[PDB]
Amino acid sequence: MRIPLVGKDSIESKDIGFTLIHEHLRVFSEAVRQQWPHLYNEDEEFRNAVNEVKRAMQFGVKTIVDPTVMGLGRDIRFMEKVVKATGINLVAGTGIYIYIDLPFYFLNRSIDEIADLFIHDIKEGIQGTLNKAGFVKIAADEPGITKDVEKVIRAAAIANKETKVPIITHSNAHNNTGLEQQRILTEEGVDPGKILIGHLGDTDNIDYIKKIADKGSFIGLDRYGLDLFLPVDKRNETTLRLIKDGYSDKIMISHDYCCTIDWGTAKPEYKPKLAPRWSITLIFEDTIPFLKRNGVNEEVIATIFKENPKKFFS
Amino acid sequence: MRIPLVGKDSIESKDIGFTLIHEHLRVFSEAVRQQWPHLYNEDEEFRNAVNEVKRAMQFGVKTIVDPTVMGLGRDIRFMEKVVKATGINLVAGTGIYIYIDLPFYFLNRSIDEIADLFIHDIKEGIQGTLNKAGFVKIAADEPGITKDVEKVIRAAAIANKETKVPIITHSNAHNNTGLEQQRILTEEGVDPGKILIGHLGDTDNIDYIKKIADKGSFIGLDRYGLDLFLPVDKRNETTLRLIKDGYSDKIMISHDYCCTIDWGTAKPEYKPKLAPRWSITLIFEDTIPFLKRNGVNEEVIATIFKENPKKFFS
Numbered sequence: 001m002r003i004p005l006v007g008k009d010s011i012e013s014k015d016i017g018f019t020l021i022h023e024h025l026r027v028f029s030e031a032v033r034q035q036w037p038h039l040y041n042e043d044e045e046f047r048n049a050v051n052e053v054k055r056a057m058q059f060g061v062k063t064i065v066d067p068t069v070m071g072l073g074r075d076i077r078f079m080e081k082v083v084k085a086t087g088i089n090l091v092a093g094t095g096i097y098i099y100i101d102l103p104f105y106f107l108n109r110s111i112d113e114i115a116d117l118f119i120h121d122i123k124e125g126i127q128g129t130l131n132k133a134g135f136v137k138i139a140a141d142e143p144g145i146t147k148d149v150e151k152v153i154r155a156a157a158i159a160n161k162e163t164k165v166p167i168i169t170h171s172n173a174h175n176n177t178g179l180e181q182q183r184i185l186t187e188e189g190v191d192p193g194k195i196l197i198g199h200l201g202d203t204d205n206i207d208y209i210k211k212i213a214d215k216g217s218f219i220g221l222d223r224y225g226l227d228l229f230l231p232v233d234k235r236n237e238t239t240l241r242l243i244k245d246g247y248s249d250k251i252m253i254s255h256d257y258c259c260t261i262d263w264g265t266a267k268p269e270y271k272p273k274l275a276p277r278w279s280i281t282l283i284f285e286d287t288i289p290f291l292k293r294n295g296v297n298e299e300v301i302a303t304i305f306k307e308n309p310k311k312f313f314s
Numbered sequence: 315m316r317i318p319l320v321g322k323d324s325i326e327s328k329d330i331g332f333t334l335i336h337e338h339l340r341v342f343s344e345a346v347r348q349q350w351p352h353l354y355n356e357d358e359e360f361r362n363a364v365n366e367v368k369r370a371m372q373f374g375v376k377t378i379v380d381p382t383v384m385g386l387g388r389d390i391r392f393m394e395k396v397v398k399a400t401g402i403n404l405v406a407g408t409g410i411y412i413y414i415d416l417p418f419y420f421l422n423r424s425i426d427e428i429a430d431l432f433i434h435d436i437k438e439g440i441q442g443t444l445n446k447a448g449f450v451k452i453a454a455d456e457p458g459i460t461k462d463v464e465k466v467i468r469a470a471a472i473a474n475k476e477t478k479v480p481i482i483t484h485s486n487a488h489n490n491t492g493l494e495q496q497r498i499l500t501e502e503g504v505d506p507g508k509i510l511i512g513h514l515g516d517t518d519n520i521d522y523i524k525k526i527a528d529k530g531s532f533i534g535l536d537r538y539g540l541d542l543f544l545p546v547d548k549r550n551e552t553t554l555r556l557i558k559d560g561y562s563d564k565i566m567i568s569h570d571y572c573c574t575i576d577w578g579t580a581k582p583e584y585k586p587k588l589a590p591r592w593s594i595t596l597i598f599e600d601t602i603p604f605l606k607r608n609g610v611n612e613e614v615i616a617t618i619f620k621e622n623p624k625k626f627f628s
C-alpha cells in the first residue's frame with residue numbers, strides 16, 4: 001500500500017498515526033566524511049538517534065519522516081539499524097539538497113536524468129537496497145533559485161507526476177524561495193496539496209506564510225527549538241494566530257532536529273547560545289500545552305499531526 | 315625519504331625518474347556515488363586504470379602524480395589496487411577541489427581547521443590508511459577567487475609551510491586565477507618554486523604564461539589531448555616557443571587524463587568530438603616527436619619530465 005517504510009512492509013496513509021513530518025537521525029557532508037573519516041564516530045551517532053526516537057515514541061509519535069537526502073549524507077543502512085533497534089515507522093526520501101550548484105557529475109545532464117535518479121529510489125530502491133523512497137526533498141536558500149536549484153525542482157515535479165509521492169522543501173523564510181518553489185512545481189503539474197513548503201516558521205511575516213497556504217500547499221512551521229532563526233515564543237504566537245485565522249488545514253509542525261550534525265554552526269558549545277531547548281520532543285513539552293491553554297481544541301492537534309500528514313501522503 | 319608513495323615505501327626526490335605530474339586514475343562526485351551506486355562499475359574503472367598505466371610504463375614513465383582530492387572522489391584503496399596490478403610509483407595528495415563554495419561541514423570553521431585536515435593526510439595518512447600525501451591540491455575556475463576558494467588556498471599555504479610539500483593548482487587560463495593563486499600563496503610565505511600553476515596550457519597568451527614563470531613557479535602545460543580547451547597543434551607551438559625563449563627550467567607537461575570520469579560533459583562518446591587523441595601517452599606520440607623534429611634535444615626533455623619534478627619535490 002502507498003507508503004514505503006524503512007525496514008518494514010509498507011502501510012496505508014490512514015495508518016500513519018501521530019507524525020513528525022521533518023526530523024533528521026543524522027546529517028553529514030558526503031565528500032568530507034569520505035575523505036576524512038577520522039572526524040566521525042558511528043557509535044555515538046547511533047546512540048543519539050536511538051535515544052531520541054525512543055523518547056519520541058514515549059510521547060506517542062508513531063511515524064517520523066526523515067528528509068536526509070543527497071548533500072545531507074543519506075544512509076539507508078544506518079536507518080535500518082535505527083528502525084530494528086526502536087521499531088519506529090520511518091519514511092525515507094530521495095532528492096538533492098543544494099544552495100547553488102550541483103556536483104560536477106551533473107555537468108551537462110538533463111532534468112530527465114536527474115528525475116530518473118529519484119524515480120529509481122522510489123520504484124526500485126535506495127543505495128542498492130530494497131527500501132523505497134516515500135517522497136522527494138528539494139532545497140533553496142539565500143542564493144535564491146539558481147539555474148541548478150531550478151533543474152532539481154522541475155526534476156522533483158517529474159518524479160511526483162510519475163509516482164504520486166509528495167514533495168518536501170527547504171526554503172529561506174525571508175526570500176520568497178518557498179513561493180517560487182511552489183510556483184514552479186504547480187506550473188509543472190504538481191498538485192499544491194502534495195507540497196510541503198519548509199521553514200516558514202522562521203519568520204513572523206504572516207502575510208507571506210498565508211500566501212503559500214492560500215495557494216494550496218502545506219506550511220512548514222518546522223524548526224521548533226532553533227532560536228537563532230526564530231525564538232520558540234514568537235513561533236508559538238505565529239502558530240496560534242494562524243490557527244485562529246483558520247489555517248490548521250495547512251499547518252505542519254516539527255523540530256528539524258538532527259541527533260548528530262557535522263556543520264560548523266552546530267556543536268555544543270553553541271547550543272546554549274543558539275538552540276537551548278532543541279530536541280525531538282519539544283512540542284510536547286512546550287508548544288502543545290501552550291496551545292491547549294490558549295483556546296485550541298483537541299481536534300486541531302489531530303488535524304496538524306494526523307490528518308495533515310495522512311492527506312499529504314494520499 | 316622525502317616523497318611518499320601509494321602502496322610503497324617512500325623515495326628520495328632524485329629517484330623519481332620520468333614523471334607525469336598530472337594524471338587521474340579515476341574521478342567521481344562523492345555525493346553522487348554514495349547515494350546512487352547503480353551508476354558506477356568498479357571492475358570497468360579498475361580495468362581502464364590498469365591498462366592506461368601499463369602503456370605509460372612501457373613508454374618509460376616511472377612516476378605518476380595523481381591530483382584527485384576532495385570533490386574529485388579520491389580513493390586511496392582503489393589507488394592501492396592499481397599500484398599492486400602495475401608496480402607504478404604513484405604520488406597521492408590532499409586538498410580541496412571547489413569552484414564556488416565549500417561543503418556545509420565548513421560553515422564557520424577556521425582556515426586552520428582546514429589546514430589540519432591537509433596536515434593529517436600528509437603526516438598521519440589517508441582515509442584510515444598508512445599511505446601519505448606528498449602535495450596539496452587546490453582549485454579556482456570561472457567564478458574567480460571566491461571567499462571559500464581563498465580559504466582553501468590560504469590553508470594550502472599553512473600545510474606547505476608546516477610540511478614542506480609542494481602545491482599543485484587548477485586554474486582557468488583566461489581568468490587571472492593562476493596569477494592570483496600564486497600571489498596569495500607567495501604573500502603567505504610560500505616559496506614560488508613549490509607551486510605548480512595548472513592549466514596554463516589552455517591558452518595562447520605567452521605573455522600571461524611567462525608572467526607566472528618570471529615569478530618563480532612551474533607553469534602547467536598539462537591538458538594535452540583536450541582539444542576543446544586548446545588543440546594539440548596550438549599547444550605544440552606555445553610549448554616550442556616557450557622552450558626557445560629559455561623557459562624549460564619552469565615548464566611541466568602532462569595530459570590531465572581521466573581513465574574514468576563521471577562528469578556529463580565528459581561522456582565517452584563525446585571523445586571523438588571534443589578530445590579525439592586524449593590518452594596517458596599522447597606526448598610520447600605527438601608532442602615529444604614534434605619538439606625533437608624542431609631542434610630541442612634529449613636533455614631538454616629530461617629537464618621537463620625528470621629534473622623539474624625532482625626540483626618540485628625537493
Ligand SMILES: CCCCCCCCCC(=O)N[C@H]1CCSC1=O
Nearest residue numbers: 024258265266267268270271274275
Ligand atoms: C547548537 C545547534 C546550532 C544551531 C543549528 C544551526 C544549523 C542550522 C539548522 C540546520 O541544522 N539545518 C540543516 C540541519 C538539518 S538539514 C538542514 O537544513
Ligand SMILES: CCCCCCCCCC(=O)N[C@H]1CCSC1=O
Nearest residue numbers: 338341579580581582584585588589
Ligand atoms: C571525454 C570528452 C572530452 C571532455 C573532457 C571533460 C572535461 C575536461 C577534462 C576534465 O574534466 N578535467 C577535470 C577532471 C579532473 S580536474 C578537471 O578539472
Ligand SMILES: [Co+2]
Nearest residue numbers: 169170171198
Ligand atoms: Co532544511
Ligand SMILES: [Co+2]
Nearest residue numbers: 483484485512
Ligand atoms: Co584541474
Ligand SMILES: [Fe+2]
Nearest residue numbers: 022024067256
Ligand atoms: Fe531539515
Ligand SMILES: [Fe+2]
Nearest residue numbers: 336338381570
Ligand atoms: Fe586534473
